[PDB]
Amino acid sequence: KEVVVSETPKRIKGLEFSALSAADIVAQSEVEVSTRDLFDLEKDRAPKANGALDPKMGVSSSSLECATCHGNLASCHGHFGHLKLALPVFHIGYFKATIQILQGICKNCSAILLSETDKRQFLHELRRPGVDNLRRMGILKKILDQCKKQRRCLHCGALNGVVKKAAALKIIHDTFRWVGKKSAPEKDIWVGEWKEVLAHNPELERYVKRCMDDLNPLKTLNLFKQIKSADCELLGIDATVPSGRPETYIWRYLPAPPVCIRPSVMMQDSPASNEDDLTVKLTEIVWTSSLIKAGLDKGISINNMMEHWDYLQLTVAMYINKPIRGFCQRLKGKQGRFRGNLSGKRVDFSGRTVISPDPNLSIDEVAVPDRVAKVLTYPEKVTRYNRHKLQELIVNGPNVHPGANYLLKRNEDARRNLRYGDRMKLAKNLQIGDVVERHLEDGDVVLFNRQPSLHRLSILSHYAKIRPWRTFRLNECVCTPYNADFDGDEMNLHVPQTEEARAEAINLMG
Amino acid sequence: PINGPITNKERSLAVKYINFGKTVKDGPXXXXXXXXXXXXXXXXXXX
Amino acid sequence: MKVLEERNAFLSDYEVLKFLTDLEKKHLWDQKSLAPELQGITRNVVNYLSINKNFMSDESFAELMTKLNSFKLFKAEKLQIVNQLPANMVHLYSIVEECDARFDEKTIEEMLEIISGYA
Amino acid sequence: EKAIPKDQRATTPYMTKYERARILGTRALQISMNAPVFVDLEGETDPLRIAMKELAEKKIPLVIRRYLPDGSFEDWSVEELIV
Amino acid sequence: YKGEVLGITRFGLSKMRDSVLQLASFEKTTDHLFDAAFYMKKDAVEGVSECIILGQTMSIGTGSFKVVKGTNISEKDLVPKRCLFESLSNEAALKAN
Amino acid sequence: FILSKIADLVRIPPDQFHRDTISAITHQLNNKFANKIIPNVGLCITIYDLLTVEEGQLKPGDGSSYINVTFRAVVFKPFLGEIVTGWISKCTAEGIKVSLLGIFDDIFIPQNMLFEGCYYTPEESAWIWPKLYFDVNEKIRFRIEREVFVDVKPKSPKEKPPAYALLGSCQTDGMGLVSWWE
Amino acid sequence: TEGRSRDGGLRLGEMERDCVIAYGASQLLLERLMISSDAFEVDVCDKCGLMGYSGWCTTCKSAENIIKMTIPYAAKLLFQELLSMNIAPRLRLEDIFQQ
Amino acid sequence: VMTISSLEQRTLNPDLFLYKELVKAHLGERAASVIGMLVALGRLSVRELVEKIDGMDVDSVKTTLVSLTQLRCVKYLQETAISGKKTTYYYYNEEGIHILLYSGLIIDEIITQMRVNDEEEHKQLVAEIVQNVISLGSLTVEDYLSSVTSDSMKYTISSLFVQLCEMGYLIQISKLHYTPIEDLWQFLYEKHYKNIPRNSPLSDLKKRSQAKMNAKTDFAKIINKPNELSQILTVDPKTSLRIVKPTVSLTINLDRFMKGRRSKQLINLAKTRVGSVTAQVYKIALRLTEQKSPKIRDPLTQTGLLQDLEEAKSFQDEAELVEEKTPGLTFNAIDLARHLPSASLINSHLKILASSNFPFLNETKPGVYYVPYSKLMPVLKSSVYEYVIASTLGPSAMRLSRCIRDNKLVSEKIINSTALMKEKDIRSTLASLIRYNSVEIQEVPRTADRSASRAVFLFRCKETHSYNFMRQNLEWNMANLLFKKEKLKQENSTLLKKANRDDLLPSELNQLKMVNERELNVFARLSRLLSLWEVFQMA
């Protein structure tokens, strides 16, 4: 019972970039979407049931029992599920690389068209122990332009042309630039095929022609299922086989995102529950997907289903790439832009106020007004010493300056905030392992800052003080480092937390 | 597909197949110098 | 957590009670001073162990080797007969592999009489 | 991997100011965790100011450990170090 | 030092550093993420701006050394003896048979 | 019972600095395993000795003492085929479940390899042999045969619990009751 | 958040970020940009480096190899963004101790 | 849910895992490592094995090397560089694992076709002899003869030894016989590029004819060397009967084993289309003429080099003319009811096999008749493939397959009319037909220039893509077949070890019969689809 658990400090080394293939997502599946469209609502109290949004996927509200785990928002993070897409719908980002993987490969054999020593020489090249990233781009280019000039197919027999990707998201390989006025064995069959066509109905073929040949996402996926092992390295894919080799670059499954990715945007000036754009996207996918799923064996026809399946690749490419964009943007466009000037946030336990001189304050001393010192806390762990005075700070109350606004017991409660009541007897126990936040006072360490930072002399650290009125006042000895003309400018204030970082600031940055 | 318990002859062939496999697993003595073009491999082939 | 080996030298149950008497002696030493969460194994071991041989020794244990030497019973049976079913007929029939077999009429009865010389 | 003996060292005998930052920080953090003190303590508050007093008499039972690029390790005692 | 003069510009900033996150940090967005996935880069998390992402310590300045206090335990009391084990056990199978 | 040899890392707080190392590491190691089950090595009971202990390190943001040591802990399993004293506890129609007081109730022997004439009855009569039978509170000798190991499900704060489970085959005569003899 | 009528805060810029780097203080940066702002824990496994919930690695069910550590919320959020798009932000771990 | 549906293993191992699966049952552990890595990375070097896996260096490598060499599971090649030293590169060797997948199947045909004698001691004799051959991987005559007991008949086992050489089957061990076809062609291509004493810079195209023609005649002597050689085997010293050379060793061969099953495929087509007697008349012909018939050996020049665009035929028809030559010239003149185990002349039964030709055989020359080995394959691949769709899906799937193969690349307009009956059900099975490849989809728009919907559609060709999908049937069938048979072992491993030591209780014998049942049937399923795959490996 209750097997032992051990722990050791762990750092991070490197990452590994790759594509998860078909094993993970289905195994990463908590639930399955199924159903279709709507919210899949229950019609009584209006909750969500299965489908896109669902209790065991994620939680957009304060209660919302997850049933996979418990403690809702304060515990659960996110869970993953998959979606079944009818037919291998094409990718978006890998599309550029998908042309390259479709380039150096035979259409005859669906195999590499290179020959002997050529392959042998390049295989020796990249295996040189040291390599620059530039060496990768150089050779994978070279080897790709080497198969351009060769008009001759190896074993597997006859051959084809090149692929120029004419169109979007429509891939067409034009067989072209055949030997001039030289009869090919395939050409005799080629022109022979059309002779049986133009015989029946001469009207249409002569009207429009010379579109050569395209490649459907389904058959090019079946064209990738031949090459395995051998060399995928010249194609840029190394196999230690956590993954199933480049069959992964075409969508079959799909990682339906948790509710931690997008929630249901809360309320309004009027009571309601509002969806977010990403929710509308994938719930629409289940519809246009099951459209092909439903009709196969029963209804419709040939030329109808087609563009609907061609509409599917338009949706997914739109999905992960009134913008209506739900994904590729928020990753790219989140609270920042680079013109050479970035943007930032997140500074807690702080304050801001104007400036004002004083002769009496020595350097490294900075007077902080008591009014902002009441709302400015700091963690303290009472041991062997503080027991005397800190228990007096508890009974003092969060009104006068020498007091404490919070208390934390080693028994790990939620927290003890002392405003509403208590005090008194509560200060009688005060076990050693507790934590109490005292008001800011003299003898502490606080670092000084000005927003338009220039050089190393911007950030400094001083002692604090408690004085009247309201302002941030410092010695007039230094106007230099912050370039302070006074005039009623603005000044940042930052107070550390742990004893480590506090001793770090004053004994070094002082 | 189809099949089932058909062709007792094939069953005997299957039994033999299992027997031949068992004999290989039990086995690993000369092997001599044969066909070795590598002096390093020939030295290890001595034992 | 890392393990340096499967199994070290075989330890039967004798010194368990002896060195858990040290664990006893250290913390509160139970019954005597009666007038954490180690109490699970503590009350458990001493109870099962001691109650057996009642209804032990020091020297005669190490002196029990004498005739237990000349026997070929090896290891698995050796440290086993220390406790279970001493000194009557078909008792030891079960524990030892191959059982009676080779020697029967007298020599095995020499086992019974000596292990009956325990209590 | 193995430690270079106390005999010979290529490292400078003095201490960096960055080292002092961690020392006072470390030891004072142990005070808040309710450790004992090896130095006489006058009546006062906080872990920080009693830590600087502790370093004044060099009562810190710590051994500074430094690393080279080749992994030749090191051993340096705080008490033996002089500034 | 690399043997060719280049740097400080987005076209020239990629010369030595193999870290994709810090290069996608200063200037780039789409390419470096997909390029590193294509060629299946690995590299490592080493530098400063690289570590402040994953939220771990730093290899320079104050974090250039490891603080230690030493126990200095004796090598004597560490070894007791196996009690009444190797005596009866082994000598039981080694006599007369 | 058997003696395992393992290694581990111990974190001792500043509070234990007043005492001796070996005494501090002891208590800590006791809070580590004790009654808890150790994977694949069997169930552990107590701690024996301490070896190899060296200078402990310190991480920047704590102030504690981290020491990596190896030690030999006393664990429990007799061997594949050993017979050991015990007695039954509960029952249904599967087979009898024998519990050894002092270690665990985990031992359960279903009736398959048992004597040819054994059967459970809904009549509330436990078992019957074509000799006699017995019930709870009476001592039982059981032999070990099969052993299985599984992982653990996540803990749920306020069935498949086979953390450590042993079963056996008693068919050889003279097992299950000690008063049949003598 | 930012501004007024909600709640306040302050600003640490990259221009300013280099200043505290120039002092060479590692400890100050660990507290301010992690503990002081957003502190988060993420369950990760050594094999198939990824993120998961509780004791489940999901796609592989083990609970034996899962190690729990700390890491900024922006990191995980960046990973959940990347990973949903087709890329692998895999993570491997190593022990600091044992020399 | 629960992953027990085996979706985990489904995606990531085409080809590949096949090889190291079989050798795992053979040996396992280290043996599966090297071969499995030899496949994935292809060409491999001795030092390179150590780097990747950290495979217990130099203890396993040297051990696995000689282990794979005796059974020749690795293709060996050695050369040097302009810099210096030496290098030895290993390849996955032919199919030697498929032979391990064969085993008794080979010995089957060995026993069955060894008749024209009648039910002799041969059964228990050569069963012991052949099983000793394949297992060791190589057998010298004398050292093997030493294994035979003394004070008995020594030529009793040698009664059939020189009869093992026979016509096909076991041949001698010769030199470089194991060698990459690409490499041996390049090594033999030396003395060709190398040959000219600064002759003259005229007609650069003559360098083509020079090297090629001289390579082809030098290639023929090498490939026909193992084929037919009477030197070693037919040695006949006095004071005895014909006895094979005690020095030169032997090895089995691809010749008549791959031929025997190929004839069966022809028989299965024969027997279907004619009577049982006609199948026998056609059989007795094939048995005599199978020796000089290349058949399975047909291309022999294909692997290892380019063909051409232009000269492709001049290559192909050069093979087709020698495929015209040998069958026409060499093969048997008309006989009359040779022996056999209908009186007068049986050629009348050939005439009913004559008047009816399509789909297959019945090619005649004046004075001599024989079955072509070239034009026979297309109608052979047709039938079998059509029977596959017949077996897998219903009757509707059949009819539409040929409907696309009558004419070519047409729309649904004349298809709906000319196919059978109903639109909706056709669209149903059209989706089932277009489900996995094999009809593709056409490429052309109707006046949209690739823009949008309502464009014309056509169904066309794609043979090799309608072929390779039967090559995906190779591994994944046998995979789970053999795997869950092996998983049946480790699960029952505790039982099997108890059974082996016994060689008791009601329930122990129950699970003993269980596994043995599953064992038998799963090997019968193996050989079944085994015969199905073998016909789909060509054209």
Ligand SMILES: [Zn+2]
């Ligand atoms: Zn949850």
Ligand SMILES: [Zn+2]
């Ligand atoms: Zn090709």
Ligand SMILES: [Zn+2]
């Ligand atoms: Zn995992």
